[model samples]
Target chain A: GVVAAAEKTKQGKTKEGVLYVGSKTKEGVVHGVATVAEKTKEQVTNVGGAVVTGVTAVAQKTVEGAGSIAAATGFVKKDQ
Target chain B: GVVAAAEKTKQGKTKEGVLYVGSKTKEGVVHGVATVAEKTKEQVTNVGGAVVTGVTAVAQKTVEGAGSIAAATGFVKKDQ
Candidate 1:
């Protein structure tokens, strides 16, 4: 769990901020940020297994302290 | 210029961090973060005219204070 947790944290921790996984474990949150980062376009809006799918979904999660990835993820129609 | 700058800032500021354009004006830096944020997969690596292409490109620019977007963009093989 620790190793996986660190691995997941590393994914979203690139140049961006942290992708909050919330109460869920890394295994469970796989469909979330981890999945979102690994896949391609069509996958941008909705990842496999992630509760936080699409721009809006990721935006909602980003509201916490994940930085401003919301706009980059296409969360809003118009940005900055 | 002000409006465009704000808009560009907003894109990468969602939940993760900021995408620095450096020295260049917003209009000139179009192929950079702004472009990268607007496009899809293959686009993720190299935007239209952005000097900061791919995860590494964004990651390099992110080294400043743009949060931790570096990892998310795939700048490094292993991350936080």
Candidate 2:
């Protein structure tokens, strides 16, 4: 695809922030402040985990980031 | 501050998102899609680095989080 891997990594992190907020809220946070605070950062809330699903999701996407840097750098080099 | 460190950490992460988006855009991301997508997460954009300024911000603030849990938990434990 024409898309970059670095882009995907950022999106993945974004999802985690949203997830951490949702799960902590559902599980009940320290006085509900964490929940409300996480909510302000998102348009909507969704839950995932830092376990396999969330960890793997972030890990897999981030692993190849330098590849994008290399490829995009190469792309820019070619443009130069 | 009287607020939770957990809240500060999320704010730090939120600030990181805003920073990453701003930096990448300024530094030039792959075709700018990453920049546009990042801007959507916040109502107003403020940029801070993930280095000493950003890393220290999130790190120092997050370091004391379980204290809040202990304090709040004990408070709740007494009530229960």
Candidate 3:
């Protein structure tokens, strides 16, 4: 699941932020974000099992301490 | 952290959405939503510091716009 992937990526850190997941569809851009904690890479690998299907893990990172206020951003292109 | 209190309450704004964080660990009422932007009051205390916590951050505010979309919602009560 997207949340699992996000949670995996975020663990053991105080700097919890949002995880925006966007996927392009024939319609337009579908986006969603979830609050995530700082986690270990291993955890990410473990939790991010095959659950992450049909969605590209475009980008994942910490929310910048300043400017714009968007934690993470990414897009999933869809084939038409 | 909590996305740095939602990017210090979404500085400037750009119609961004999605920031759902829910809680409740006794089998009942666990909801989430995203609808936040607009910030002030001390950068969320310089990114929360601490690990292994249950969480509780009452509520935050932002300008009202859009529909059904979310930016930041809170509810972390796990007492059993």
Candidate 4:
């Protein structure tokens, strides 16, 4: 949800080269090529309207939704 | 990383509809051409000196990482 919200606020303009989600490994990548390409086509319907098309299931739990507990306990850390 | 640091502090403005991650049934719909097209051309390259490409990799466990010990307690709880 946070990613979506952030992306929406940026509209069509996106960070070049920086893949939003998933790892770059063969099995870890979020399939960005397929997902982004698909979403781009859908956006043509109305020019201003954007459509989300991907729904990748991450193996590890996202730290965002974990709230501050994980941060406080230092249980999880961001790769970046 | 917290949704790209909150979309880079909202550099570009956006948001019209809400279609975040995924989840859309195809068997329960009756409207116009729900063809669900895929593929679109993306342009608008780097405007700034930022072009960090993708290089996703899984987290690697390290010995010098921070250590912690969970307290001897009962079942944990904290959703908020």
DockQ of 1: 0.04
Q: Which ranges of candidate 1 are over 4 A from the true structure?
A: A1-29, A33-80, B1-3, B7-41, B45-80
Runs in model 2 deviating more than 4 A are A1-80, B6-42, B51-80
Model 3 chain A is weakest, by summed lDDT over 10 consecutive residues, at A42-51
* lDDT, candidate 2, A5-79, per-residue tens: 212223213333322211111221111101223333332221111111210111112112111111111111222
Q: Could you list the chain B TM-scores for each candidate? A: 0.13, 0.15, 0.18, 0.14
The digit string of per-residue lDDT tens for model 4 on B1-80 reads 22322122225433333222223222221121123334543232111111112222222111211222212122235434
Against the reference, the lDDT scores of all candidates come to: 0.23, 0.19, 0.24, 0.23
Q: TM-score for every candidate vs. truth?
A: 0.15, 0.12, 0.15, 0.15
**Residue clash pairs of candidate 4:** A24-B56
Which is better, 1 or 2, measured by lDDT? 1
> In model 4, where do residues sit more than 4 Å from their true spots?
A1-26, A31-80, B1-42, B56-80
lDDT of 4 by residue, A1-80 (tens): 32323212333354323223432223222232221345442221111111121223221211221111011112233334
List model 3 lDDT by residue over B1-80, tens digit each.
32321222342324434455343323222122222333321112111211111122222231222111112322323344
Off by over 4 Å in 3: A1-80, B1-13, B27-52, B56-80
Chain A TM-score values, per prediction: 0.13, 0.14, 0.20, 0.14
**In order, what DockQ does each candidate have?**
0.04, 0.02, 0.03, 0.06
RMSDs, each prediction?
A: 22.0, 25.5, 22.8, 22.3
